[PDB]
Symmetry: D2
């Protein structure tokens, strides 16, 4: 299992959100360096979001480009995109960050 | 009044209006219905408790959200959404919001 | 097996283990118990349907989370958390996760 | 009713999260631009978070400094902070962004 997985469930259809761009960024100085970008697969997943580069401890941000996702469906959303910031304090462990998504609401958490 | 509920449709970011919500008390066997009402235009029922003092114990509100979506020609995972909660202090304000989507929801103790 | 559930404790970011979960079917305004089990160390019940053929209908899983918290001397707003859902298609997989805190939760149809 | 209100509910206590720093930023051309900073009162609320300048349409973000909030209680959290990004498409509307907060999970939405 990859250090970082993400997935998106669309709570309006009760199905995965497919083909959503998701970026990964590392905090550095007062900003953020992009480490990767990928798109959720047909099951709404990116099982392995970390690039082929050793992960270091630090703070990271995943950005779910959900605004574009909704825009392709002619749907408005309150959020142009959804950033989620989290600590990686242990590079030996698996980090899983699902997104439960609606147009005007969402939930995120550390999964298993 | 010791019990308020509201429903926010997370798909529209607007209140769910005219949704039937029931209130029940847990009895020794089964439940007893205390009240029924409908959310107003702001998705609220400000005063869901009937005109009777509350006692400590378990209660259940049931948001009839399947009907609400059906009127929109929309399918939902849930026929309805029961929320069971515990009243421990009887003169305290209890607030049970529902953040609703067709295939997902959240509830909590509100302010 | 057509029904899985899991519970994630949003306060620890870890699964909720050894939580009792019942499954019931709706019948005549009541509910018939069909099975009961305990989430494993991963907070999962992979196969909650009993070993009889599934039928269409409405069903209710009840996560005994008030008991889960009480074991840890933690109070909860909710003595248990019922989730009601349609089964329209008997051949498909139904997955009902619970994101759990003492005074709030979320549930949805998972993948 | 104010262009921007936020509040926080601690889902672990079922009570408001108090004295939590919240910043407001606009997505300006030169990067994100701080507009205001403020603290939830005892009720976990900031009922007017907009500064004393006219609002324009555009993208904005509030950052709830919840990592600090938990750190004061000797509690760990997955998130150092929680940014929430959103569109203001109509300046004469009221935007309300609640946060339902747990150590390893949160929800947010456009409230009323
Ligand atoms: Br995944
Ligand atoms: Br209300
Ligand atoms: Br499972
Ligand atoms: Br507020
Ligand atoms: Zn996943
Ligand atoms: Zn960190
Ligand atoms: Zn995982
Ligand atoms: Zn894992
Ligand atoms: Zn309310
Ligand atoms: Zn009770
Ligand atoms: Zn209230
Ligand atoms: Zn209150
Ligand atoms: Zn599961
Ligand atoms: Zn049904
Ligand atoms: Zn499943
Ligand atoms: Zn499945
Ligand atoms: Zn508020
Ligand atoms: Zn915008
Ligand atoms: Zn408001």
């Amino acid at each position: 299992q990859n250090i970082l997985s993400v997935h998106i469930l669309n709570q309006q259809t009760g199905k995965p959100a497919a083909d959503v761009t998701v970026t990964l960024e590392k905090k550095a100085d007062n900003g953020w360096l992009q480490l990767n970008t990928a798109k959720t697969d047909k099951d709404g997943r990116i099982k392995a979001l970390w690039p082929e580069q050793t992960a270091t401890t630090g703070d990271y941000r995943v950005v779910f480009k959900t605004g574009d996702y909704f825009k392709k469906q002619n749907l408005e959303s309150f959020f142009p995109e959804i950033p989620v910031e989290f600590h990686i304090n242990k590079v030996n462990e698996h980090y899983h960050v699902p997104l439960l998504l609606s147009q005007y609401g969402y939930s995120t958490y550390r999964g298993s």
